[PDB]
Amino acid sequence: HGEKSQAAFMRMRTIHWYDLSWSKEKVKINETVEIKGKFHVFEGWPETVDEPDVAFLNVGMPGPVFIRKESYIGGQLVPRSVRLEIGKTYDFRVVLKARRPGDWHVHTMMNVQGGGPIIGPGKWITVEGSMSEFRNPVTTLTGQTVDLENYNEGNTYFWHAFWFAIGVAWIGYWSRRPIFIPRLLMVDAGRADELVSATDRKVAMGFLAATILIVVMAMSSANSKYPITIPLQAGTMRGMKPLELPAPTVSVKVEDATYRVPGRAMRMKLTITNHGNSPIRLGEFYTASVRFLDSDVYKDTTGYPEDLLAEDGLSVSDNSPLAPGETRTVDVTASDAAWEVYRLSDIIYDPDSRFAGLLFFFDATGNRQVVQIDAPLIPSFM
């Protein structure tokens, strides 16, 4: 819900999310929904964004309407920040547990230490039930099971109320007598030395000694109880395992790319060379969370968000099968209302008019090839 405002070229060339899947579209309270997919770190990472040396796999959502039970990059849990390598493809998996009823737009996002949020596609997930039914149990290494919704809440309230009461007692003790104007007049007109006299000093000594003694006793008691404590666990985690993708058998060279101002379409001319031994066909163009599909070649079945999915938004001038070894140049047009709804047309406002995306090529048997394209995007006005 935080994208459509970021720069179009920055959304195009940071991170490409694909193979996204959602386990469920509608859940109950305490029910789990799993989000899977892959993201590729673009080679032409913008210089204004710091390299993803420190990155965190986050969830885009309006507060804890879900709780993040687990999150994985590769196959290993990532509760801390992680290091990503430019040009590598990683697979991710986020497990969410429903907490608050309603209709929520859930995004998978990557926060980069020096570049800000990179928001992936968002999907509407319905939560039904009552928040009062939500439980977040956890078992500690000390052998006790607690609910994270209310654990330590009573202790926190008690201690804060106790110290607030001590301070209020001090202030009220000094506030029983007249406060401002008579004391000001006494201090000004001659030496005061009358508004602070025993047993006021004795009361202050008692307050100070009691404060120190209570702090020490409370710390000792909180050490006898909970004798086993550990510091906060933090630190960027290295050695994220990237996907070992096979080398693509399709090479694509972008010969100019244009978009009409104003308009809802993007046009580019591609020289596609088919290696390997199977006839390929262009089935998809993904630019920034928007999938332009050639419906005659490929159809989406993973429940991709409709406002981000162009079922027939990809038109190829000659999308006949490309025989192996054969090279041809075609005009590819990606047109959909999403191009203007998600403000991908506002790249005219950007200080770097370059686009990047993913082309998905499909053969007859159905196996697909992913190739990455990037080129300057030239607006056309007449």
Partner 1 sequence: AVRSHAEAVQVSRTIDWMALFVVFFVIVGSYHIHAMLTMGDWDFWSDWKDRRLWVTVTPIVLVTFPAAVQSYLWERYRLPWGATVCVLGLLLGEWINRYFNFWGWTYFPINFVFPASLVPGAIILDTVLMLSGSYLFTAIVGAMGWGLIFYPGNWPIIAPLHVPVEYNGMLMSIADIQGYNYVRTGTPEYIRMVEKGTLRTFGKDVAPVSAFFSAFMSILIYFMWHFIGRWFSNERFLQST
Partner 2 sequence: LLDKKWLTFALAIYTVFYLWVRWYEGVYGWSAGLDSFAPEFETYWMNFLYTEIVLEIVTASILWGYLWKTRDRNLAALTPREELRRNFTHLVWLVAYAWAIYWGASYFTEQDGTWHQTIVRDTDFTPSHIIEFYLSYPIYIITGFAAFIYAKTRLPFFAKGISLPYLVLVVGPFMILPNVGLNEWGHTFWFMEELFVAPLHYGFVIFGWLALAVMGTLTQTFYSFAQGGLGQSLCE
Ligand X SMILES: CCCCCCCCCCCC(=O)OC[C@H](COP(=O)(O)OCC[N+](C)(C)C)OC(=O)CCCCCCCCCCC
Residues touching ligand HXG, count (CB under 6 A)? 2
Choose, by CB under 8 A, the member of 77, 165, 169, 184 that binds partner 2.
184
In 3D space, the residue among 141, 117, 144, 129 whose CA is nearest the CA of residue 60 turns out to be 117
Check residue 229 for interaction with ligand X (CB under 6 A).
Answer: yes
> What residues contact residue 228 under an 8 Å CB cut-off, 6+ apart?
141, 142
The footprint of partner 1 on residues 238-297 (CB under 8 A) is 256
The footprint of ligand X on residues 106-145 (CB under 6 A) is none
User: Distance from first CA to last CA of the chain, Å, rounded?
Assistant: 33
CA distance 254 to 375: 6
CA distance 58 to 140: 25
CA distance 296 to 268: 20
For partner 1, what does the binding mask look like between residues 141 and 160, x meaning CB under 8 A?
A: xx-x-x-xxxxxx-xxx-xx
Centroid of chain to Cα 221: 40
- Residue showing tokens 């697979």: 91
The footprint of ligand HXG on residues 111-130 (CB under 6 A) is 114
Q: How many CA atoms lie within 13 A of 225 on its CB side?
A: 6
Task: Report the nearest approach of ligand HXG to the CB of residue 47 (Å).
Answer: 12
**Furthest-apart CA pair in the chain: how many Å?**
105
Check residue 236 for interaction with partner 2 (CB under 8 A).
Answer: no
Choose, by CB under 8 A, the member of 44, 117, 129, 248 that binds partner 1.
117
Count other C-beta atoms under 10 Å from residue 335's C-beta. 19
Check residue 381 for interaction with partner 2 (CB under 8 A).
Answer: no
Find the part of the chain contacting partner 1 (CB under 8 A) among 35-43, 200-208, 331-339, 360-368. Answer: 200-208
Choose, by CB under 8 A, the member of 5, 23, 48, 175 that binds its own copies.
48
Q: Which is nearer to Cu ion, 42 or 285 (CB)?
A: 42
- Residue showing tokens 């968000």: 305
For its own copies, what does the binding mask look like between residues 221 and 250, x meaning CB under 8 A?
A: -------x-x----xxxxx-----------
The footprint of partner 2 on residues 1-40 (CB under 8 A) is 1-5
Task: Report the nearest approach of ligand X to the CB of residue 219 (Å).
Answer: 6
Q: Does the annotation place 16 within a ligand binding site?
A: yes
Check residue 102 for interaction with ligand HXG (CB under 6 A).
Answer: no
Cα→Cα distances 15→31, 41, 52, 56, 131, Å: 30, 5, 10, 13, 34
For ligand X, what does the binding mask look like between residues 199 and 218, x meaning CB under 6 A?
A: -----------------x--
Where is the binding site for Cu cation, in residues?
A: 1, 16, 40, 105, 107
